């Protein structure tokens, strides 16, 4: 039964993890239509998923290089990860979204106009979130269970989706990626307390668990960023998210590859969700 820390360790899950659980959620490869034309994603069904209950929601995103069946590839084993933590009670039930920056006019810089128009409404309108529609209005009404994340190029989308869809999503996970909006790791962090701003929300609506590893390359842009945002107002350092709303988790020895990332997941993913949840829980 999971219980924040105000300064979680890195971790990485059991190597039994990696193997298939019994109680395996349902992948289903999905087909759509949107402002960048026709493109696919995977989505991830957590075991039992009843569409009369309603589900926090995590979008993820691949690296360069990848695509939408990367994550749950062979070569990454996502799903066994979330199948075994969910069983076992470390991860509440959720569902895993993993789209694509590929195809048409879409590039990680700007694939959260095509996730605001398209990849939300199309999803959230087929499977139980949070999301009573997928209005602009219902879509905004749910934002505390929907989380984004990504790694490397990923990690890039997502600094780009936090500061244009705060409305949106109120979890952030970049991974061994840093925003690429600034000539200063100060104009960075001052961007995204402009758009902080600009929303209105509250120190107690968005949080960031951000992560990388002690040898991975994206530590030298990430780290000076992460200690330019850290002197902000905006944000309250700490991985006790009843608390505060920010955290930089940083693996030692660990390096640019889903070995690792993986792992990082494993560790922040079970952090989400749980401020103002609708559920009666002690963490």
């Given at each position: 039964?999971?219980?924040?820390?105000?300064?979680?360790?890195?971790?990485?899950?059991?190597?039994?993890?990696?193997?298939?659980c019994?109680?395996?959620?349902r992948?289903?490869?999905?087909?759509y239509?949107?402002?960048?034309?026709?493109k696919?994603?995977?989505?991830?069904?957590?075991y039992?998923?009843?569409?009369?209950?309603?589900?926090?929601?995590?979008?993820?995103?691949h690296?360069?290089?990848?695509?939408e069946n990367?994550?749950?590839?062979?070569?990454?084993?996502?799903?066994?990860?979330?199948?075994?933590?969910?069983?076992?009670?470390?991860?509440?039930?959720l569902?895993?979204?993993?789209?694509?920056?590929?195809?048409?006019?879409?590039?990680?810089?700007?694939?959260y106009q095509e996730?605001?128009?398209?990849?939300i409404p199309?999803?959230?309108?087929?499977?139980?979130?949070?999301?009573e529609?997928?209005?602009?209005?219902?879509?905004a009404?749910?934002?505390?269970?929907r989380?984004?994340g990504?790694?490397?190029m990923?990690?890039?989308?997502?600094?780009?989706?936090?500061?244009?869809?705060?409305?949106?999503?109120?979890y952030?996970?970049?991974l061994?990626?840093?925003?690429?909006?600034?000539?200063?790791?100060q104009?960075?962090?001052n961007?995204?307390?402009?758009?902080?701003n600009?929303?209105?929300?509250?120190?107690?609506?968005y949080?960031?668990?951000?992560?990388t590893?002690?040898?991975d390359?994206?530590?030298?842009?990430?780290?000076?960023?992460?200690?330019?945002?850290?002197?902000?107002?905006?944000?309250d350092?700490?991985?006790?998210?009843?608390?505060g709303?920010?955290?930089?988790?940083?693996?030692p020895?660990?390096?640019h590859?889903w070995?690792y990332?993986?792992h990082?997941?494993?560790?922040?993913?079970?952090?989400?969700?749980?401020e103002?949840?609708?559920?009666?829980?002690?963490?």
């Amino acid at each position: 039964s999971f219980k924040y820390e105000s300064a979680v360790q890195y971790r990485p899950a059991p190597d039994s993890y990696l193997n298939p659980c019994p109680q395996a959620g349902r992948i289903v490869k999905e087909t759509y239509t949107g402002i960048n034309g026709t493109k696919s994603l995977n989505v991830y069904l957590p075991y039992g998923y009843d569409p009369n209950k309603k589900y926090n929601i995590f979008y993820l995103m691949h690296g360069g290089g990848e695509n939408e069946n990367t994550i749950f590839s062979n070569d990454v084993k996502l799903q066994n990860i979330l199948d075994h933590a969910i069983m076992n009670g470390e991860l509440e039930p959720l569902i895993v979204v993993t789209p694509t920056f590929n195809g048409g006019n879409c590039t990680a810089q700007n694939f959260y106009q095509e996730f605001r128009q398209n990849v939300i409404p199309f999803v959230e309108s087929k499977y139980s979130t949070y999301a009573e529609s997928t209005t602009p209005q219902g879509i905004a009404a749910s934002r505390m269970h929907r989380g984004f994340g990504g790694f490397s190029m990923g990690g890039l989308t997502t600094w780009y989706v936090m500061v244009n869809c705060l409305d949106y999503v109120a979890y952030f996970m970049p991974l061994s990626g840093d925003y690429w909006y600034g000539n200063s790791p100060q104009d960075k962090a001052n961007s995204i307390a402009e758009a902080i701003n600009r929303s209105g929300l509250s120190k107690r609506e968005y949080f960031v668990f951000a992560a990388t590893g002690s040898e991975d390359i994206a530590y030298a842009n990430m780290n000076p960023q992460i200690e330019a945002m850290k002197a902000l107002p905006h944000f309250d350092y700490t991985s006790d998210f009843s608390k505060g709303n920010f955290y930089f988790l940083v693996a030692p020895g660990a390096t640019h590859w889903w070995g690792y990332v993986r792992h990082y997941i494993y560790d922040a993913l079970p952090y989400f969700f749980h401020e103002l949840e609708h559920h009666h829980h002690h963490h």
